[PDB]
Design an enzyme around this catalytic site. Structure first.
Site, PDB file in Angstrom:
ATOM      1  N   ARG A  79      20.915   8.390   3.030  1.00  0.00           N
ATOM      2  CA  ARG A  79      21.939   7.369   2.422  1.00  0.00           C
ATOM      3  C   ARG A  79      21.431   5.718   2.374  1.00  0.00           C
ATOM      4  O   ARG A  79      22.170   4.798   1.746  1.00  0.00           O
ATOM      5  CB  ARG A  79      23.346   7.268   3.065  1.00  0.00           C
ATOM      6  CG  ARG A  79      23.858   8.617   2.678  1.00  0.00           C
ATOM      7  CD  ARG A  79      25.371   8.301   3.472  1.00  0.00           C
ATOM      8  NE  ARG A  79      25.246   8.928   4.944  1.00  0.00           N
ATOM      9  CZ  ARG A  79      26.019   8.758   6.021  1.00  0.00           C
ATOM     10  NH1 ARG A  79      27.035   7.971   5.777  1.00  0.00           N
ATOM     11  NH2 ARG A  79      25.818   9.252   7.088  1.00  0.00           N
TER      12      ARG A  79
ATOM     13  N   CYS B 187      24.545  13.316   4.843  1.00  0.00           N
ATOM     14  CA  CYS B 187      23.339  12.873   4.031  1.00  0.00           C
ATOM     15  C   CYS B 187      22.568  11.944   4.893  1.00  0.00           C
ATOM     16  O   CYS B 187      22.926  10.938   5.451  1.00  0.00           O
ATOM     17  CB  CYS B 187      23.679  12.388   2.804  1.00  0.00           C
ATOM     18  SG  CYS B 187      22.368  11.647   2.109  1.00  0.00           S
TER      19      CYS B 187
HETATM   20  C1  HEM Z   1      17.498  10.482  -2.059  1.00  0.00           C
HETATM   21  C2  HEM Z   1      17.068  11.687  -1.466  1.00  0.00           C
HETATM   22  C3  HEM Z   1      17.895  12.272  -0.808  1.00  0.00           C
HETATM   23  C4  HEM Z   1      17.592  13.137   0.467  1.00  0.00           C
HETATM   24  C5  HEM Z   1      16.349  13.187   1.068  1.00  0.00           C
HETATM   25  C6  HEM Z   1      18.792  13.561   0.900  1.00  0.00           C
HETATM   26  C7  HEM Z   1      18.887  14.521   1.835  1.00  0.00           C
HETATM   27  C8  HEM Z   1      19.867  15.149   2.380  1.00  0.00           C
HETATM   28  C9  HEM Z   1      19.708  16.204   2.887  1.00  0.00           C
HETATM   29  C10 HEM Z   1      18.611  17.081   3.665  1.00  0.00           C
HETATM   30  C11 HEM Z   1      20.993  16.923   3.118  1.00  0.00           C
HETATM   31  C12 HEM Z   1      21.436  18.069   3.604  1.00  0.00           C
HETATM   32  C13 HEM Z   1      21.327  19.226   2.639  1.00  0.00           C
HETATM   33  C14 HEM Z   1      21.487  20.791   3.539  1.00  0.00           C
HETATM   34  O1  HEM Z   1      21.478  20.921   4.978  1.00  0.00           O
HETATM   35  O2  HEM Z   1      22.046  21.650   2.648  1.00  0.00           O
HETATM   36  C15 HEM Z   1      21.834  16.012   2.436  1.00  0.00           C
HETATM   37  C16 HEM Z   1      23.048  16.607   2.324  1.00  0.00           C
HETATM   38  C17 HEM Z   1      23.937  15.375   1.079  1.00  0.00           C
HETATM   39  N1  HEM Z   1      23.644  14.525   0.361  1.00  0.00           N
HETATM   40 FE1  HEM Z   1      21.903  14.020   0.444  1.00  0.00          FE
HETATM   41  N2  HEM Z   1      19.751  13.406   0.145  1.00  0.00           N
HETATM   42  C18 HEM Z   1      19.339  12.267  -0.898  1.00  0.00           C
HETATM   43  C19 HEM Z   1      20.109  12.074  -1.769  1.00  0.00           C
HETATM   44  C20 HEM Z   1      21.263  12.202  -2.219  1.00  0.00           C
HETATM   45  C21 HEM Z   1      22.097  11.720  -3.340  1.00  0.00           C
HETATM   46  C22 HEM Z   1      21.542  10.939  -4.313  1.00  0.00           C
HETATM   47  C23 HEM Z   1      23.403  11.986  -3.146  1.00  0.00           C
HETATM   48  C24 HEM Z   1      24.580  11.982  -4.022  1.00  0.00           C
HETATM   49  C25 HEM Z   1      24.834  10.578  -4.662  1.00  0.00           C
HETATM   50  C26 HEM Z   1      23.488  12.569  -1.828  1.00  0.00           C
HETATM   51  C27 HEM Z   1      24.563  13.107  -1.183  1.00  0.00           C
HETATM   52  C28 HEM Z   1      24.418  14.161  -0.312  1.00  0.00           C
HETATM   53  C29 HEM Z   1      25.603  15.189  -0.110  1.00  0.00           C
HETATM   54  C30 HEM Z   1      27.001  15.086  -0.685  1.00  0.00           C
HETATM   55  C31 HEM Z   1      25.490  15.897   0.894  1.00  0.00           C
HETATM   56  C32 HEM Z   1      26.197  16.919   1.706  1.00  0.00           C
HETATM   57  C33 HEM Z   1      26.460  18.140   0.605  1.00  0.00           C
HETATM   58  C34 HEM Z   1      27.201  19.244   1.864  1.00  0.00           C
HETATM   59  O3  HEM Z   1      27.972  18.715   2.403  1.00  0.00           O
HETATM   60  O4  HEM Z   1      27.002  20.433   1.639  1.00  0.00           O
HETATM   61  N3  HEM Z   1      22.415  12.853  -1.239  1.00  0.00           N
HETATM   62  N4  HEM Z   1      21.188  14.973   1.750  1.00  0.00           N
END
Ligand code: HEM
Ligand code: HEM
Ligand SMILES: C=NCc1cncc(OCc2ccc3ccc(N)nc3c2)c1
Ligand SMILES: C=NCc1cncc(OCc2ccc3ccc(N)nc3c2)c1
Ligand SMILES: C[C@H](O)[C@H](O)[C@H]1CNc2nc(N)[nH]c(=O)c2N1
Ligand SMILES: C[C@H](O)[C@H](O)[C@H]1CNc2nc(N)[nH]c(=O)c2N1
Ligand SMILES: [Cl-]
Ligand SMILES: [Cl-]
Lengths: 362, 362
Positions: B68, B65
């Site tokens: 974060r 992510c």
């Molecule tokens: C606040 C805005 C946020 C942005 C812009 C953001 C951005 C991203 C992006 C671009 C990805 C890659 C997704 C992909 O390639 O399919 C990602 C992955 C991830 N994000 Fe975030 N994120 C945000 C908030 C959060 C929140 C609130 C959580 C959970 C509490 C979180 C947990 C994760 C997780 C677990 C992944 C990986 C999922 C996987 O392994 O397939 N993120 N994030």
């Protein structure tokens, strides 16, 4: 015990090399002579066939290389006979000439005598045989920052650069038994350069950008069957992204994106306008267009990726394991538009291969 | 022994969580009650403070992510009290509403009762609470191919999609003790969608592209101190590239690059023209422009990378190790234009965290 590492590597290489050349029955006898040679001399000498194929295997095993499809067509120049700096110089001049081939670039490697006791016969200081100098003084930055340390080293040896943004660094190498390296200024007639223009943006020429035609990496070590060829310059043709998305784009390189945005008539004020991304595309289009227009070989990242897919397919058909470094194979622009992005690669190191080695400067 | 893994994880979590909240002196007593609770019941129940912070720690530990930086401002909704499918449905409806927040997206997580014996209390089938259906029949492809298997599953349960390219999938989840999942059609009034237009290419609207406002991932497992919250949907705001460079660009998704090249008036004939790269940039510019214009939260990849750099800096100052997945952190367009590309990351897994889990369909 040094005669043991060498002996083990030799057995592995000769067996594999002779398998591939269909000379499997000659392995036993060749291994015999090598065994005696290591006993008596402490090393062994490759046949031209072994050396040529070893160099080809090494390219095939380069995990970070996207252009490996054409590994078997590598032009190998055996120069293990050189003894003088004049000979090294002329061999390096020749490499530039034949590899350039008036623009129709031939992937070529020139192989110099290998390390003896780990003692270098020839020690090349250049990262690439053709590269631009870099200067940093009083807040004034000129040329390629990547070359700052080598440039200062050359200027310690009596060379002086004109301090344009594109000073050709001299060839600089050290012969065994000499304390200092010698330097030779490059004959301009050997060096092809490409002025960077845009196919439909006429103002792009105002940037006065250019790059050299042939990337000839000259500071890596070729390892073949326990033999360390520390001096073996090699070249391919450029992938456009190397120049457009890195060399001319990196903030720690020529850092030209702001100026590109200006000449293409877009604002560089907001991240949300994606002006860096747009500037990168036009600059990379310009590079490809410019090399094609001058008749200098180049490949775009999409075509290169397609070729690499075929290399993958070829590897499977031949029964060879595929190895690769995903982080380097993906192109620095639109990587998700290539198949490479969407699969994984085993980054295991297989020999023969090309390796990093310590620099004699810095 | 199952009471041992749980006990060990609990000790590690409580110690760390209470350190961070400055409640270090209360660890010993809290660990006591938990120890008895595990002995007597076979599990333990988090306080609201532990659950909230555990969810925040989990986001902070998500290696893949880029967003974060704002881990500590996560809006945690404790719904461990739900017992009926009507309650689950209304909790999911509510999550959509509050997270959407009329476009000013609030990063939110709704936490449902955790696994008992590894037995799920609630089992959500949706990958995201809001997602488009996908169909494949007789060479005819409609909608999002990524949703083909879930869509067929829903249609096995009496649901029927209109077969537009943008059918909203129904919420579908299964309650403990039920053999089949139930499905509820989404109230359109809860779902914000963004039509995709270009800031200066008027013809871009001819593509009739759109996407939903809020990505609410609903099929991952939240693990906190040995407790497995298999149902805990969470959301942030989109990074533009997710939509423009992947969802609408991938050949195995909406595959729109050829059509983008057409409406922006460039040929899609030669790799050397870099038409895919150019189409990607304009499409991604369109997405960002469209979300901003409708007042729906979104971030571009450059700004997001800058924020992530601050997260790195914040981690160092706090004395916390940084972990990350370089292959996922780099944006799919102009990755070398971000600092992320030029450094490495330790991909070690730290708990609390969010995990993949097996699907009940396919
Ligand atoms: C606040 C805005 C946020 C942005 C812009 C953001 C951005 C991203 C992006 C671009 C990805 C890659 C997704 C992909 O390639 O399919 C990602 C992955 C991830 N994000 Fe975030 N994120 C945000 C908030 C959060 C929140 C609130 C959580 C959970 C509490 C979180 C947990 C994760 C997780 C677990 C992944 C990986 C999922 C996987 O392994 O397939 N993120 N994030
Ligand atoms: C024929 C055209 C070729 C193309 C288009 C090509 C393309 C590339 C590119 C783009 C890189 C990444 C460079 C960087 O990011 O700095 C690379 C790396 C590499 N290529 Fe090739 N290559 C070609 C031929 C060759 C040849 C002839 C050799 C040697 C026999 C070779 C060996 C390597 C090695 C060793 C690396 C990695 C260097 C390192 O680790 O820093 N390639 N190649
Ligand atoms: C100093 N930059 C890192 C670096 C270090 N040491 C060797 C390197 O080689 C990069 C490299 C190697 C071989 C190439 C062959 C063809 C080509 N177009 N680029 C190529 C680029 C790069
Ligand atoms: C099916 N695609 C792979 C996949 C699987 N399982 C979970 C995934 O989550 C991606 C993901 C997770 C959290 C996010 C939060 C915010 C955001 N803008 N995108 C986000 C994207 C992705
Ligand atoms: C093979 C590779 O792991 C896979 O294709 C990854 C690469 N990096 C990625 N990065 C992000 N953010 N999202 C993805 O879906 C992927 N795909
Ligand atoms: C941190 C990372 O290993 C480093 O920045 C790499 C990433 N991938 C790369 N890939 C290529 N082809 N060339 C490079 O210089 C780099 N840099
Ligand atoms: Cl280069
Ligand atoms: Cl998504």
């Amino acid at each position: 015990e040094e005669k043991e590492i060498l002996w083990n590597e030799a057995k592995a290489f000769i067996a594999a090399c002779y398998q591939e050349l269909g000379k499997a029955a000659e392995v036993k006898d060749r291994l015999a002579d090598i065994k005696s040679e290591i006993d008596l001399t402490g090393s062994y000498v490759h046949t031209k066939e072994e050396l040529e194929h070893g160099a080809k295997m090494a390219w095939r095993n380069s995990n970070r290389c996207i252009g490996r499809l054409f590994w078997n067509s590598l032009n190998v120049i055996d120069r293990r006979d050189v003894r003088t700096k004049e000979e090294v110089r002329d061999a390096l001049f020749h490499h530039i000439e034949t590899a350039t081939n008036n623009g129709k670039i031939r992937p070529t490697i020139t192989i110099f005598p290998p390390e003896e006791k780990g003692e270098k016969q020839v020690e090349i200081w250049n990262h690439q045989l053709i590269r631009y100098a870099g200067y940093e003084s009083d807040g004034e930055r000129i040329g390629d920052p990547a070359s700052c340390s080598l440039t200062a080293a050359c200027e310690e040896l009596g060379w002086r650069g004109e301090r344009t943004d594109f000073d050709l660094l001299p060839l600089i190498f050290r012969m065994k038994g000499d304390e200092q390296p010698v330097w030779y200024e490059l004959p301009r007639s050997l060096v092809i350069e490409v002025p960077i223009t845009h196919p439909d943006i006429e103002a792009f020429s105002d940037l006065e950008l250019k790059w050299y035609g042939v990337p000839i990496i000259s500071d890596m070590k070729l390892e073949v069957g326990g033999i360390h060829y520390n001096a073996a310059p090699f070249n391919g043709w450029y992938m456009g992204t190397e120049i457009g998305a890195r060399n001319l784009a990196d903030e720690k390189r020529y850092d030209k994106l702001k100026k590109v945005a200006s000449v293409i008539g877009i604002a560089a004020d907001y991240n949300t306008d994606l002006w860096k991304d747009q500037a990168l595309v036009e600059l990379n289009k310009a590079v490809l267009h410019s090399y094609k227009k001058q008749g200098v070989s180049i490949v775009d990242h999409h075509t290169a990726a397609s070729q690499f897919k075929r290399f993958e397919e070829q590897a499977e058909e031949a029964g060879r394991k595929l190895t690769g470094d995903w982080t380097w194979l993906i192109p620095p622009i639109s990587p998700a538009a290539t198949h490479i992005f969407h699969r994984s690669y085993d980054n295991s190191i297989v020999k023969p291969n090309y390796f990093y080695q310590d620099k004699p400067y810095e």
